[PDB]
């Protein structure tokens, strides 16, 4: 009903574009180029080659007090309830709730350029640009070198979530515990449609 | 003042790349309902940047990490850094190795089969114009550029080899003997 508009078309070209080239993370390729000045006469011609790398996405994972799992790959989030053995599927871009991990995890000009921030020292309190209901509010407070030290959400129901963190380990950490398989046994609710 | 607090918070977390935190939680109702508490655990991987490598045809090299340009010519053994926000054109390479909806969302895109056309919302940019002719299976086929100057550069591609490539492309160390000009302050 609601019809498609040029902001909208342009919208879904871009995505289109970017699912397109979310298939290659990696690719080497020979070209030709051919350079022209302005007017239309051939400034230049030759061959070279191209060899990009693209970035991959964020990964996290978090144990609840209750000892249930979230766990992100970037595209799905996985929520894994080992007492009762369920688990959840859903993509990302659908998921709902545990937004301060989504941009904790990307770290994101973009991400960050949806909220009005006001920064206190190492202090950052953060209110969302579109009103929607996403998050209420959200708080962090980032020591100079990176270190989150705590951080608070408060929901559109005005459910408030404060977390105090400690005995930040840096350092890598290997790349199969970001993904997820549900074990064998486990009730799978794969709601990627 | 709330984009300088955007860009702080940004290069305070660009600082760290993974972490493993534990952490305290409480969780409470609107009226103040102490619903939840205790500790869990949290592991994060922050996004690398991208990376690409050209060889022009006058085989002089432009490397990228994500933070630093460099371009280097081996005949004349001269090789310059500028950080890559300072940097000036070879736009094309960096949208097509980044990949991100918000660098695309910076122009008005149309699109015909696999051919897009790219203009820019921001009319004061680097790029008059883009196009570029991607593959359902992400294969760029080809892609021409216009600058400023109305120059146009036109790329056709070929022996797309996807696959793993070895870090050592992406990664500049000037060699012995090649006069840097670190224009990095």
Redesign the interface.
Known sequence: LVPRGSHM??????????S?????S?????????????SGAA????????????????????????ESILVSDGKTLWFYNPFVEQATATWLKDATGNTP?ML???????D??Q?????NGDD?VLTPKASNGNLKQFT?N???????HQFSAVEQ?????????????????D?A??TFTPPQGVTVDDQRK
Request: net charge positive.
């Open positions: 078309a342009s919208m879904d070209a871009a995505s289109d574009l970017k397109r080239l979310d298939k290659v990696s690719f080497h390729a020979s070209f030709t180029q051919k350079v022209t000045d302005g400034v230049q011609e030759g061959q070279g080659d191209l060899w990009v790398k693209r970035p991959n996405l964020e990964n996290w994972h978090m144990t609840q007090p209750d991990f904790i995890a990307r770290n994101q000009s973009s960050w350029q909220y009005n921030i006001k920064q950052f962090i980032v020591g100079r070198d990176g270190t989150i129901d005005d459910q408030r979530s404060s977390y105090q963190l400690k005995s930040q380990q840096n350092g890598a950490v790349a515990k970001f």
